[PDB]
């Protein structure tokens, strides 16, 4: 029978491919969830396993966990369980706006961030203080962001016309508008900031710890 027995991979980094694979699956599940929010459809765990993480089912807690967190913080969407393994997706703080009219990425998350920034400067925040905080998270005046669009139009026009905000000549400054006061409160925005800052952070597992879920 005798043949050629001499000796993976050729050589490729399986460990770092793994954390990238998980991180891409966080991105992918997040976009999937946004679609489910747009469709006003419920979402089941089973659906998520079958349709998005068929090949990493046991990582569900971590991939779903981080995708949820991104929905909350970036998009202002809360992934609410029903209690089951079904979940509905609704805007944070009960806000009625998401900016889908852009029929893709909700802008609730950035509204919430601008409302919190004013809530923290007290009764009003200056134009400059709003641009600084938007800057720290990569949103700049006159620069069309992919997820949020052009922000000056967004702050100064859309959100003024929608009455979430007021923008006036005092330097310039922003204040909550009647809709913002109607739909939410300073107390609720600040408690939300507080709950987000205090959240249990999720670590990506190593290849070893992930093998230890079976």
Residue numbers in the entry: -14 to -8, -4 to 0, 101 to 171, 174 to 191, 194 to 262, 269 to 312
Provide the authors' own sentences about this structure as they appear in the paper.
All MAGE family members contain a shared core MAGE homology domain (MHD) which is a ~ 200 amino acid long domain, which is well conserved across the entire MAGE family (individual human MHD’s share more than 40% sequence identity). The MHD domain structure consists of two highly modified winged helix WH domains WH1 and WH2 in a tandem arrangement linked by an extended β-hairpin. The biochemical basis for this activity appears to be exerted through binding to and modulating the activities of RING domain containing E3 ubiquitin ligases. Rather, each MAGE protein appears to recognize a unique region on its RING partner, suggesting that MAGE proteins are able to function as a versatile and adaptable protein interaction module.
Crystals of MAGE-A4 diffracted to 2.3 Å resolution at Diamond light source beamline I04, and the structure was solved by two wavelength MAD using SeMet derivatized protein. The most prominent difference between the two structures is the relative conformation of region between helices α5 and α6 (residues 230–241 on MAGE-A4) and the positioning of the extended N and C termini. In MAGE-A4 the C-terminus is more closely associated with the rest of the molecule and forms a longer section of α-helix, which packs against the first and third helices of WH1. In contrast, the N-terminus of MAGE-A4, which includes 16 residues that were part of an uncleaved purification tag, is extended and forms an interface with neighbouring molecule related by crystal symmetry. Nevertheless, it is possible to identify three possible hydrogen bonds and two buried aromatic residue (Tyr -4 and Phe -3). In the case of MAGE-A4 this is unlikely since the interface is formed from residues in a purification tag, which are not part of the biological MAGE-A4 sequence. Analysis of cleaved MAGE-A4 constructs by sedimentation velocity analytical ultracentrifugation reveals a single species with sedimentation coefficient S of 1.46 (Sw20 of 2.34), consistent with a compact globular species with a molecular mass of 23360 ± 1937 Da, which matches very closely to the theoretical mass of MAGEA4, and the calculated hydrodynamic properties of the monomeric model (Sw20 2.43) using the program HYDROPRO.
